[PDB]
PDB file of C-alpha atoms (C1' of nucleotides) and ligand atoms in Angstrom:
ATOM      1  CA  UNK A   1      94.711 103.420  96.737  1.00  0.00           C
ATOM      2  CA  UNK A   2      96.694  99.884  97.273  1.00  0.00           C
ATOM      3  CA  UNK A   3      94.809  97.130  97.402  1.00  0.00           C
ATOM      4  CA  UNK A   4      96.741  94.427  99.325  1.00  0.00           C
ATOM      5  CA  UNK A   5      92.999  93.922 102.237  1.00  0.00           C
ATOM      6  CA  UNK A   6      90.875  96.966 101.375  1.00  0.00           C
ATOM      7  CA  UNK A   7      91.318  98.979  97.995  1.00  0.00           C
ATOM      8  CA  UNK A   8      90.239 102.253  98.040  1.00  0.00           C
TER       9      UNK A   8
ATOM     10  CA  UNK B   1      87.218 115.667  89.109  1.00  0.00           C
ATOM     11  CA  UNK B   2      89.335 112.015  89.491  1.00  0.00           C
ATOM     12  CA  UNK B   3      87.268 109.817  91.930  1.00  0.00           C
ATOM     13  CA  UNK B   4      90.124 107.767  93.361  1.00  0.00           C
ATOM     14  CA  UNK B   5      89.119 108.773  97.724  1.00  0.00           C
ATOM     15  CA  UNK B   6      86.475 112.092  97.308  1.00  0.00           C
ATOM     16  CA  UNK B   7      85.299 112.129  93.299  1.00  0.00           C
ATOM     17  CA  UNK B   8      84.551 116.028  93.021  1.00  0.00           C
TER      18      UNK B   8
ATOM     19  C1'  DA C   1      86.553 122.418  94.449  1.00  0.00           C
ATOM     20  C1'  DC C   2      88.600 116.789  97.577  1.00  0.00           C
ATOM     21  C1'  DG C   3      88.796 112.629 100.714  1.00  0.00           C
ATOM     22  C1'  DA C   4      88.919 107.440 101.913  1.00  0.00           C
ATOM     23  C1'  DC C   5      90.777 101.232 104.352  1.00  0.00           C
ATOM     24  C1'  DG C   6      90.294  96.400 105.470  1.00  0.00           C
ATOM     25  C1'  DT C   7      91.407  91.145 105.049  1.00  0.00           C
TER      26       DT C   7
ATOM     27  C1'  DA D   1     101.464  93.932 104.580  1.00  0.00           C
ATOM     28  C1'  DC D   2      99.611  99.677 101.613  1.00  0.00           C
ATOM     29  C1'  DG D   3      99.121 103.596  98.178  1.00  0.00           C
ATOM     30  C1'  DT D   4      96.544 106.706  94.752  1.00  0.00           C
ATOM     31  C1'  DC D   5      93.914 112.189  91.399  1.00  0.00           C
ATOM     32  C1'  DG D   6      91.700 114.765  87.614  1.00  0.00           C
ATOM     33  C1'  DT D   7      87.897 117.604  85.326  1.00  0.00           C
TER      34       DT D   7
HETATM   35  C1  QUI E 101      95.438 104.623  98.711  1.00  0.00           C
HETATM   36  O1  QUI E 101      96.431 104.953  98.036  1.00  0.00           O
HETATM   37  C2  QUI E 101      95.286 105.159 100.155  1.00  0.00           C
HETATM   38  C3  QUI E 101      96.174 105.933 100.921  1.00  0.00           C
HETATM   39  N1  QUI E 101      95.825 106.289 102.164  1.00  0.00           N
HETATM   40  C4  QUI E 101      94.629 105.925 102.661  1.00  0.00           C
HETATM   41  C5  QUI E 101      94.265 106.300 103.968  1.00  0.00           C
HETATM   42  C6  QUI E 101      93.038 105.919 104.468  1.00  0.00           C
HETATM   43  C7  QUI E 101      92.171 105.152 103.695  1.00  0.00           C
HETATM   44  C8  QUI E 101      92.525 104.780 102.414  1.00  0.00           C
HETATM   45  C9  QUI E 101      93.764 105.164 101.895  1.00  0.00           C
HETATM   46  N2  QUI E 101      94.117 104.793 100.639  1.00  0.00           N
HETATM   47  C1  QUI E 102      93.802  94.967 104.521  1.00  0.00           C
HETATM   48  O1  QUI E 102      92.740  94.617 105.101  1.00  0.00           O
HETATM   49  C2  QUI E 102      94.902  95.626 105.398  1.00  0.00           C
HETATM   50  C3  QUI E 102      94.858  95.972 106.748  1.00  0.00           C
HETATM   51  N1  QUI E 102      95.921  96.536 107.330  1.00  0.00           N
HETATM   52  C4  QUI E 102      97.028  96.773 106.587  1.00  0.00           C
HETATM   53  C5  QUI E 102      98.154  97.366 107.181  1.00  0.00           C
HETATM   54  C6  QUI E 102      99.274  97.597 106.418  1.00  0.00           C
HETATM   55  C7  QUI E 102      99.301  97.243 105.070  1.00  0.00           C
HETATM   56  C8  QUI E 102      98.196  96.670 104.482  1.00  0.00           C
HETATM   57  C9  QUI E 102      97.059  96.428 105.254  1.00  0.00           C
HETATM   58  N2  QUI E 102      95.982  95.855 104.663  1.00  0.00           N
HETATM   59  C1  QUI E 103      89.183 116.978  89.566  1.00  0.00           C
HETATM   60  O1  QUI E 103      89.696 116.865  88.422  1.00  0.00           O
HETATM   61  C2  QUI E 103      89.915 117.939  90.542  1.00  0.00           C
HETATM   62  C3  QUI E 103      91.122 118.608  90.331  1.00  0.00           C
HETATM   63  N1  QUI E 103      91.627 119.415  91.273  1.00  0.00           N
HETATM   64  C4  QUI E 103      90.946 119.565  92.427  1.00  0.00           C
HETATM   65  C5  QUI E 103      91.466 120.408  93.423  1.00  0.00           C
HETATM   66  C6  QUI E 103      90.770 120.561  94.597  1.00  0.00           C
HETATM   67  C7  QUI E 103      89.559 119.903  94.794  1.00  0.00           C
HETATM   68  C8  QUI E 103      89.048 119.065  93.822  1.00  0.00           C
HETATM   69  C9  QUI E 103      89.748 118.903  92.627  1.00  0.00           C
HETATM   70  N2  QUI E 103      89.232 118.083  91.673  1.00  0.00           N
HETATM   71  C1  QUI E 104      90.853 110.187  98.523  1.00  0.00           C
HETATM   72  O1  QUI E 104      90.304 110.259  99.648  1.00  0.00           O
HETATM   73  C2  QUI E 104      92.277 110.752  98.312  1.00  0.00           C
HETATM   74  C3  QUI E 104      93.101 111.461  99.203  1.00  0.00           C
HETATM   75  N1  QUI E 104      94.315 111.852  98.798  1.00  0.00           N
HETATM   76  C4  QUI E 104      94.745 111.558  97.553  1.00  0.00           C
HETATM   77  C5  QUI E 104      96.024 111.970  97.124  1.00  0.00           C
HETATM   78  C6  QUI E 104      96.458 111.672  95.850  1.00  0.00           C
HETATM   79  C7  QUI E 104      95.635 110.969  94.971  1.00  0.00           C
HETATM   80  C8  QUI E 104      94.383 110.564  95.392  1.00  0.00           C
HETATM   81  C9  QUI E 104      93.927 110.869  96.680  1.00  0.00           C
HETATM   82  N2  QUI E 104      92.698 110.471  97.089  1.00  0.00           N
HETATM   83 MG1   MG E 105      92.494  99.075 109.910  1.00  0.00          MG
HETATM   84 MG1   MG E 106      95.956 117.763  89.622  1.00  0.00          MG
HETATM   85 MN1   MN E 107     100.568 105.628 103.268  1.00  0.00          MN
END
DNA sequence: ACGACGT
DNA sequence: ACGTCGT
């Protein structure tokens, strides 16, 4: 749910 | 119902 | 009744 | 280095 460097 | 990561 | 990620 | 949900 985090997007920092995916963001699901 | 929420899609956030499965959206039943 | 439903589970997922990459720069 | 980063965590989330409601019909
Ligand atoms: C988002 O909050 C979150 C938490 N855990 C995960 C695990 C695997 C893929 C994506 C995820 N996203
Ligand atoms: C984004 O591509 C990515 C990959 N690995 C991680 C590890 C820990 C926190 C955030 C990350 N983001
Ligand atoms: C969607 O709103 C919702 C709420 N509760 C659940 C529980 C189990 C599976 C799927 C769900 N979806
Ligand atoms: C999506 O794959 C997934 C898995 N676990 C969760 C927990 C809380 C909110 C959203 C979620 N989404
Ligand atoms: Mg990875
Ligand atoms: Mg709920
Ligand atoms: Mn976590």
């Amino acid at each position: 749910x985090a997007x920092v460097x995916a963001x699901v």
